[PDB]
Amino acid sequence: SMSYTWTGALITPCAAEESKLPINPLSNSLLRHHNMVYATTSRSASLRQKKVTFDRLQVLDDHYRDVLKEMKAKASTVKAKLLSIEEACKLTPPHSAKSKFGYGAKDVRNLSSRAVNHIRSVWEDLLEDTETPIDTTIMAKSEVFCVQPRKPARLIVFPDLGVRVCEKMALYDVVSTLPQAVMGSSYGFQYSPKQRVEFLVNTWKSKKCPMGFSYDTRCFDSTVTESDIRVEESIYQCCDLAPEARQAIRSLTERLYIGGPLTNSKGQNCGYRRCRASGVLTTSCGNTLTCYLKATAACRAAKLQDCTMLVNGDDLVVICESAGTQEDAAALRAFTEAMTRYSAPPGDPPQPEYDLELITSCSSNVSVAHDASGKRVYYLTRDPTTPLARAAWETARHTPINSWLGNIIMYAPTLWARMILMTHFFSILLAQEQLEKALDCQIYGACYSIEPLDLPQIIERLHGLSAFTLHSYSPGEINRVASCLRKLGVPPLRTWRHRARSVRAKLLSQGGRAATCGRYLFNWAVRTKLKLTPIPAASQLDLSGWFVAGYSGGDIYHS
Ligand SMILES: CC(C)N(c1ccc(Oc2ccccc2C(F)(F)F)cc1C(=O)O)C(=O)[C@H]1CC[C@H](C)CC1
Ligand SMILES: [Mg+2]
């Protein structure tokens, strides 16, 4: 069937939309080519609509059905718990879209009478009505990028705040534990960046002669069929569930997940969806399971040897035993025709790779550098273009989520995150006296509140002390960063080194946690190195909850 059907009504914004980077005194210090940075808006919604609108073709075979059964057998060991209204409300982010039923996110978190009672009524309705298509709002997503040698806006589809809390009640526990139980070491969200690197590096070095590839599915959400969503539910149903959880899942599947009506910001009937909605709680889990199912069966059809895959939502990376240049190419091509028949056609054409560093998955790649003792250490990195573009936008405007804070956490070991992101933001925070002020960021889609001052501990626990001593990066990594800096008009190392030394001196004079930031975060900027020993508060953090599952679009907040 058609992924989408349009009534002709337009995808409208619910307020003025900013497209250009403001000429701000602070952003310009970070990036000078401001005309190269832009924010996607509803003005390009039509372009995206055309790309994501098409009739899906799907042909299922014995491999598909075989993998499906293997997955179900594992789901059969799970027991989900069903969250209480209160627990569910607590998972709602403070900046979550307000309900249209007389209350907002703050009211939800405060367990206000009007939020709870309405939420209760939406839940009773899921138990009683198993058919009526639940209403969804479709909006053009606002995302920042750097122009290329422009991306149309992404389309987000999400139901009312009331339905969102209900999703959590019924499926939060399911989407947090089932993926790992069914996919094992292949589920990527259970890994922190260092651990994802470990898994990739080990899988790679474990092969006699490794061959790997990333697989980009052209517009994955739209390739998701009604069959995929019901199959997905068949997996969730293998869990021991509370009677009401079971019914809620059944109802949500038929009324929300398989598809439903689309309404714009003006309340006008916009169209109908028969594919994956990006803004629901099961998106990440549903995409991971579906992508894992199709790719696993495709590998079997393609005769790829000793396949090892890692999956994160629609993102897929596979590593296997090479059978020779020619054979590998053919087998990969076969894998693709197999994924195509499963309604998962390729966007970027897949290509075999024999150099781990060149393999890009989850927009990142493994690279290597050396610690103070000259020891080789592998870490995760990525092209810094988008991160810096977004850092500049966030420097000019206030935003609910601060991608720069998340990028510093996830990419702490990198040359670019350390030299620029850390130097730039600590300079601003210290100048505005806001080092104590906790800010929100996202990790695997979930929103977290983090105090800039705890970064030292955090970084040590997640990456190890070597994160503060890496040097001698790969020429490939160095060429990519330098290339990025010239393009965006970012000041050279010498300038950052000077700003970093000043930032550090001030941080040290404040003592306490600030001084701790100055010592560890910016030791690279001084010649007279300091001895970096384990930080006491480090081995006392509870970061385990950070890497359990993906939640992008799931409207999740972790206190
Ligand atoms: C070796 C020395 C002195 N060095 C580097 C300085 C620049 C660099 O990258 C470049 C080299 C030449 C031109 C442009 C660049 C780039 F634009 F990429 F930075 C790479 C390295 C490194 O450790 O490999 C360092 O000590 C860095 C260690 C990490 C901090 C945070 C910045 C300084
Ligand atoms: Mg894709």
Give one DSSP letter per residue of 218-250, joined into a string.
TTHHHH--HHHHHHHHHHHTTSB--HHHHHHHH
Mutate to test the pocket of ligand 1, among 370, 379, 493, 520 (most ligand atoms within 8 A of CB): 493
Distance from residue 150's CA to the centre of ligand 1 (Å): 31
In angstroms, the CA 363 to CA 108 distance is 34
> Domain range spanning residue 196?
1-361
Distance of CA 514 to the CA centre of its chain: 30
Q: Tokens 């292949």, residue?
A: 186
Give nearest CA residue, ligand 1 atom 24.
Answer: 472
- Measure the CA–CA gap between 109 and 105, rounded to whole angstroms: 6
171 closest CA partner among 93, 247, 265: 247
Residue 355 Cα to ligand 2 midpoint, Å, equals 22
Q: Name the residue at shortest CA distance from atom 26 of ligand 1.
A: 471
Rounded-to-integer distance, Cα 32 and Cα 482, Å = 15
DSSP 8-state assignment for residue 256: I
3-state class of 520 per DSSP?
helix
Length of the chain: 559
Contact between 277 and 164 under an 8 Å Cβ cutoff? The reply is no
Residue 316 shares a structural domain with residue 221: yes
Q: Which of 407, 409, 410, 413 is nearest to 393 (CA)?
A: 407
- Residue 317 near residue 309 (C-beta atoms within 8 A): yes
Beta bridge partners of 318: 213, 309
Ligand 2 centre and the CA of 215: distance in Å?
8
Query: β-strands 136-140, 260-263: how paired?
Result: parallel
Phi-psi region of 402 (alpha: psi -120 to 50; beta: other; left: phi over 0): beta
194 vs 201: CA distance, rounded Å: 10
The strand pair at 136-140 and 155-159 is best described as: antiparallel
Q: Are residues 355 and 447 in the same domain?
A: no
Atom of ligand 1 nearest to the CA of 481: 18
The DSSP code for 443 is E
Alpha carbon 370 to its chain centroid, in Å, reads: 28
Supply angle C-alpha 16, 17, 21, rounded to 5. Answer: 130
H or E element in which residue 262 lies: strand 260-263
User: To 10 degrees, what angle do helices 113-128 and 243-252 make?
Assistant: 80
> Which region, left, alpha or beta, applies to residue 368 given φ > 0 means left and ψ of -120 to 50 means alpha?
beta
Q: Is 135 annotated as a binding residue?
A: no
Say yes or no: 321 and 394 in one domain.
Answer: no
Residue 56's nearest CA partner among 293, 241, 223 is: 223
Nearest CA to ligand 1 atom 14: 482
Structural element, H or E, at residue 70: helix 62-75
3-state percent breakdown (helix, strand, coil) of the chain, nearest 5: 50, 15, 35
Q: Which amino acid is at 151?
A: K
Q: Which ligand is nearest to the CA of 482?
A: 1
CA distance 175 to 167: 10
315 is in an annotated binding site: yes
Find the residues whose C-beta lies inside 6 A of ligand 1.
415, 418-419, 471-473, 478, 481-482, 485, 493, 524
> Ligand 1, closest atom to CA 524?
30
Considering the domain architecture, whether residues 338 and 376 belong to the same structural domain is answered as no
* 500 Cα nearest atom in ligand 1: 31
DSSP assignment, residue 55? B
Query: Between the CA of residue 457 and those of 135, 287, 517, 537, 539, what are the distances in Å?
Result: 44, 33, 9, 6, 8
CB atoms within 10 A of CB 539: 10
Q: Is 509 left (phi over 0), alpha (psi -120 to 50) or beta?
A: alpha
Q: Alpha-carbon distance 182 to 73, whole Å?
A: 8
Experimental technique used to determine this entry:
X-ray
Which segments within 389-490 are labelled E, that is strand? Answer: 439-443, 446-450
Q: What is the largest CA-CA distance in the chain?
A: 70
Query: Could you count the other beta carbons within 10 Å of the beta carbon of residue 161?
Result: 25
Residues 306 and 372 in one domain: no
How many angstroms does the Cα of residue 511 sit away from the middle of ligand 1?
Answer: 28
Index of the ligand 1 atom closest to the CA of residue 418: 31
> Of the residues 361, 390, 420, which one is the last residue of a structural domain?
361
Q: Amino acid identity of 61?
A: D
For atom 22 of ligand 1, the residue with the nearest CA is 472
202 & 117 share domain: yes
Q: Are residues 260 and 208 in the same domain?
A: yes
Shortest-distance atom of ligand 1 to CA 419: 31
For residues 467 and 557, state if they share a domain: yes
Tell me how far the alpha carbon of residue 401 lies from the centroid of ligand 1, in angstroms: 29
Decide: residue 132, CB within 10 A, 0-12 exposed, 13-18 middle, 19+ buried: exposed
Query: Measured in angstroms, how far is the CA atom of residue 407 from the centroid of ligand 1?
Result: 19
Nearest alpha-carbon partner for 439 in 94, 186, 113, 50 = 94
- Which residues neighbour 255 within 8 Å (Cβ) at sequence distance 6 or greater? 126, 129, 130, 131, 132, 133, 134
Find the 457 Cα to ligand 1 centroid distance in Å: 24
296 to 185, 311, 356, 534: CA distances (angstroms): 14, 11, 21, 42
Residue 485: how many other CB atoms lie within 10 Å:
21
**Token couple for 289:** 């399971």
Beta-strand relationship, 260-263 and 269-273 = antiparallel
| Cα of 296 from ligand 2 centre, angstroms | 17
Task: Tell me which DSSP letter residue 274 carries.
Answer: -
Whether the CB-CB separation of 296 and 344 falls below 8 Å is answered with: no
| H or E element at residue 288 | helix 283-301
Beta-strand (E) ranges in 163-233? 210-215
Cβ distance 377 to 466 under 8 Å? yes
Instruction: Identify the domain boundary among 345, 361, 377.
Output: 361
Helix (H, G, I), strand (E, B) or coil at 471: strand
**Cα–Cα distance for residue pair 388/137, rounded to 1 Å:** 31
Here the tokens at position 319 are: 């590593």
CA of 492, closest atom in ligand 1: 17
Q: Which residue has the tokens 């006296």?
A: 433
Ligand nearest to the CA of 412: 1
Residue 371 to residues 164, 196, 361, 470, 472, Cα–Cα distance (Å): 46, 20, 25, 5, 9
Instruction: Calculate how far, in angstroms, residue 347's C-alpha sits from the geometric centre of ligand 2.
Output: 6
| Residue 445 CB contacts under 8 Å (≥ 6 apart), including other chains | 284, 550, 551, 552, 553, 554, 556
User: CB–CB of 365/214 below 8 Å?
Assistant: no
Burial 64-84 (b: 16+ CB within 10 A, else e): beebbeebeebbeebebebbe
Ligand number nearest to the C-alpha of 312: 2
Q: What contacts 484, CB < 8 A, 6 or more positions away? A: 383, 384, 385, 388, 416, 490
- Rounded-to-integer distance, Cα 303 and Cα 335, Å: 8
Q: Alpha carbon of 40 to those of 20, 67, 262, 271: distances in Å?
A: 9, 39, 21, 22
Instruction: Give the position of tokens 């609108």.
Output: 53
How far is ligand 2, taken at its centre, from the CA of residue 251, in Å?
A: 29
CA distance 406 to 444: 10
Q: How many CB atoms lie within 10 A of CB 350?
A: 18
Resolution (angstroms) equals 2.2
Distance of alpha carbon 261 from alpha carbon 321, whole angstroms: 46
Close Cβ partners of 460 (under 8 Å, ≥ 6 residues apart)? 467, 468, 520, 534, 535, 538
Residue with the nearest Cα to atom 13 of ligand 1? Answer: 482
Closest atom of ligand 1 to 482 CA is 17
CB 377 within 8 A of CB 469: no
Nearby residues of 266 by Cβ (< 8 Å), 6 or more positions away: 9, 12
Q: In the numeric block, which tokens belong to residue 6? A: 């349009």
The letter for the amino acid at 527 is R
Q: Which ligand is nearest to the CA of 215?
A: 2
> Among 417, 382, 499, 395, which Cα is nearest to 31's?
395
- Based on the domain organization, do 319 and 436 belong to the same domain? no
Are 122 and 162 spatial neighbours (Cβ–Cβ below 8 Å)?
A: yes
| Residue nearest ligand 1's atom 9 by CA | 478
List all residues 6 or more positions away from 548 whose beta carbon is below 8 Å from its beta carbon. 176, 180, 189, 190
Neighbouring residues of 210: CB distance < 8 A, sequence distance ≥ 6 = 204, 319, 320, 321, 322, 354, 356
Q: Which of 444, 388, 374, 442 is nearest to 416 (CA)?
A: 388
Assess whether 471 and 381 both reside in one domain: yes
Distance between CA atoms of residues 12 and 263, nearest Å: 10
| Structure tokens belonging to residue 494 | 């010498």
Whole-angstrom distance, CA of residue 456 vs CA of residue 530: 15
Kindly report the protein residue whose alpha carbon is nearest to atom 31 of ligand 1.
419
Same domain, 331 and 410: no
Q: How far is CA 149 from CA 146, 230, 393, in A?
A: 10, 42, 21
Q: What is the residue with the minimal CA distance to atom 7 of ligand 1?
A: 493
Cβ atoms of residues 157 and 140 within 8 Å: no
Residue 3: half-sphere exposure toward Cβ, Cα within 13 Å: 23
In this structure, the number of other CB atoms found within 10 A of the CB of residue 533 comes to 8
Helix (H) or strand (E) holding 68: helix 62-75
Structure token pair of residue 216: 């980009």
Which one of 388, 416, 478, 494 would you pick to mutate in the ligand 1 pocket, going by the greatest count of ligand atoms within 8 A of its CB?
478
- Residue 555 φ then ψ, to 5°: 55, 55
Nearest atom in ligand 1 to the alpha carbon of residue 480 is: 18
Closest CA to 509 of 501, 500, 518: 518
Name the domain count of the chain. Answer: 2
Whether residue 314 is annotated as binding a ligand: the answer is yes
Residue where a domain terminates, one of 361, 395, 418: 361
Q: For residue 483, which phi and psi values (nearest 5 degrees)?
A: -60, -45
Virtual CA dihedral for 21, 22, 27, 33, nearest 10 degrees?
A: 50
Cα of 218 from ligand 2 centre, angstroms? 5
User: Is 530 in a helix, a strand, or coil?
Assistant: coil
The alpha-carbon radius of gyration of the chain (Å, integer) is 24
> Which is the closest atom of ligand 1 to the Cα of 473?
24
Claim to verify: residue 185 and residue 134 sit in the same structural domain: yes
| Best probe residue, ligand 1, of 385, 468, 471 (max atoms within 8 Å of C-beta) | 471
Measured between its terminal Cα atoms, the distance across the chain in Å is 41
